[PDB]
Write a protein that binds this ligand. Structure first.
Ligand SMILES: [Cl-]
Lengths: 395, 441
């Protein structure tokens, strides 16, 4: 296709443009008719922009309802109605905002000016961003034998300047859920924040729980948990570019808000990083949640977890492959025997786009509704078994 | 919160899962109440194109790229869109003058652009100048997002005074720069009054001190180059100036791309790199992100690429012609009305105030007649961000008419409504409760 290094003089046929885009189109994605549906939602809300709520009160509603429903899904009632929050643009914005908030909260509240934060080494890399961005010393603690945060190590690391601790539910690298309860307990005992990163697990964990699978309380059921983030786009099945950050009580949330009084451009407030932003995306989340409902999520996470079971089984049924920790649907597989990167590469050749991890070396499969399709997991295992045979005879 | 009673509120997930039809119906229903406002040119800014078929077009684009760039290996299509959008924008802003070194990134809005630049200048200056108490010098008119960056990234923000015609006072700026100043900025134009700052002397001030010069062209980015080409008076404001080290332009505003998309440009790669974030020894693998966001809606980038290609230089020319011509007509009518006054000499974004009357009341009367325009303060005035939507027939004529009636009113009644409100910490105490009411269920 023609490359454009500079604006066309003329202006091209909309048809021609649409053709090229379609031509190219001919984890990552978390169904034909569902997508079709969200796309039509978007279309209806295309012009939306939550910065001007006076013009789009429709969006201001969507956002509020999405936050509400999510909070309730994460034990918001346990907090006794004080739980609040905001729709962000992704897990990262959620993570950044929280970190920023805890910083601001702690300066105002504790006089802390050299903020420090304690997260498991497994904690999402976005934590390091926040750290550099907002000038917070980030202290990453070690994991334990089953790749969960070592809480003792965490306890040792907290300091009079620590403003918050975090745990992942689950973490991206290995897909295990951290000891959220003892972490949130550590938190409370020191009077510092506890943030749960449930960006990945936010919309599957509550139903896995309800479903008989082993998951520790990880949300607002715990007094210590002061904030938790969950991604409505990934497993919430909302359209990409949308997420949620929740706080136990309003006093925290307010530290996240930005307000400017004497700007000649008028009064200025923004709840998030963004100023103007795509209300349309919020619509897709609201729509996706309502279309699914508790039943919808239950069924989806059932299918996913069941596939994961099947898959984990097949995998473990190769003595040369090892699963890191005991993940539920996000799986990290490594080899003490072989060059896992090669196994991953062979697999890549056979058409799989899976994520390579390191420290330790392993690739990971973020199981998705897309894998609950028939023979999919069966295909995976088959290709995997052939890939290992290869590497065995070609180190 | 008008639909409180019109539509069921959801405080918690439905047990069942609702008909997609029913859902779509409610959303469309709200859209039916809402479209006219912006579609019928009653809105200051908000919607910048608003044309039925153009929107329809971008919507179909979105649908096709329905796709994020954090996984470029899966969506190299997007990685292209973003690169081409940056390229075309840079060229439109004098990128060639910089001699091919101009680079940049697609962000999610003018704000992200502004934040990123500020962050970059901070990081650049620490690494390069050892500056650890960064300070930044912007005109008081400079967008409020500058204050955000300041609090976010721990940069002392110094706002300098404007001159009689509401342009940055460069002398004041010169006086304010310090061994710790990492960057100065100017707006092309600013949001409050829509005037373009003395970018040339500012960018000169910058170079002479070896500090950054950022031009905020979020608003003017996609109209100024064509207004220039069109015979209207606009100073060089982009990379044509050696001193300008970075400039931001919003493809979603007057670029006519779909909402949620923008561009930040740097004169040379060495600056851009300070914006990038990279994490090596995360067990989750190698991690890089060019912007604030990790995962970002590639679909939106597509809509910008598509919007730019569909328009082309001809497209922008025509559009800005129409807009500027309306603005002329409008400014004329306004200046003819005693006793109002236009602040500075804006081209399409207009700030009108009254030394004679309570402008907020004039704004409120106007509001009653159906106009959604932005109330400014310090000084008091409302502003009209002219848009393709106002280039429609009798629109400006409607505006002037309603305006003239609104002034007659206030003349004989010096006065309530939403006016009382618009009239320092109580503000934060209040605006916060407001943000809470918004999110209330
Ligand atoms: Cl706007």
């Amino acid at each position: 296709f023609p490359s454009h290094a500079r604006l066309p003089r003329a202006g091209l046929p909309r048809a021609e443009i649409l053709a090229e885009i379609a031509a190219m189109g001919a984890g990552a994605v978390y169904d034909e008719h569902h997508i079709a549906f969200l796309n039509e939602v978007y279309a209806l809300q295309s012009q939306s922009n939550p910065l001007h709520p006076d013009l789009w009160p429709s969006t201001a509603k969507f956002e509020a309802e999405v936050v509400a429903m999510t909070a309730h899904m994460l034990g918001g009632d346990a907090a006794g109605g004080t739980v609040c929050g905001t729709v962000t643009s992704g897990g990262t914005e959620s993570l950044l905002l929280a970190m920023k908030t805890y910083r601001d909260w702690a300066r105002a509240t504790k006089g802390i000016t050299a903020p420090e934060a304690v997260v498991p080494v497994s904690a999402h890399a976005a934590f390091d961003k926040a750290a550099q961005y907002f000038g917070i010393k980030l202290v990453r603690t070690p994991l334990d034998a089953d790749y969960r945060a070592d809480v003792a190590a965490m306890r040792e690391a907290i300091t009079p300047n620590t403003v918050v601790v975090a745990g992942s539910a689950p973490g991206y690298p290995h897909g295990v859920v951290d000891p959220i309860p003892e972490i949130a307990a550590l938190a409370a005992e020191h009077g510092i924040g506890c943030h749960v990163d449930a960006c990945l697990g936010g919309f599957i964990l509550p139903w896995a729980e309800r479903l008989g699978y082993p998951v520790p309380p990880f949300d607002f059921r715990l007094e210590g948990v002061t904030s938790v983030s969950a991604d409505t786009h990934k497993y919430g099945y909302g359209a990409k570019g949308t997420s949620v950050i929740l706080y136990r009580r309003p006093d925290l949330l307010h530290y996240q808000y930005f307000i400017a009084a004497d700007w000649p451009g008028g009064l200025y407030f923004s709840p998030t990083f963004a100023g103007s932003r795509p209300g349309a995306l919020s619509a897709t989340a609201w729509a996706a949640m309502l279309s699914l409902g508790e039943e919808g999520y239950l069924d989806a996470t059932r299918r996913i977890l069941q596939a994961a079971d099947r898959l984990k089984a097949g995998v473990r049924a190769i003595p040369s492959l090892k699963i890191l920790g005991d993940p539920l649907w996000v799986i990290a597989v490594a080899s003490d025997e072989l060059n896992i990167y090669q196994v991953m590469e062979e697999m890549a050749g056979r058409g799989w786009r899976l994520n390579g991890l390191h420290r330790p070396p392993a690739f990971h499969v973020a199981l998705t509704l897309r894998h609950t399709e028939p023979g999919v997991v069966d295909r995976f295992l088959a290709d995997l078994q052939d890939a290992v045979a290869q590497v065995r005879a070609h180190p």
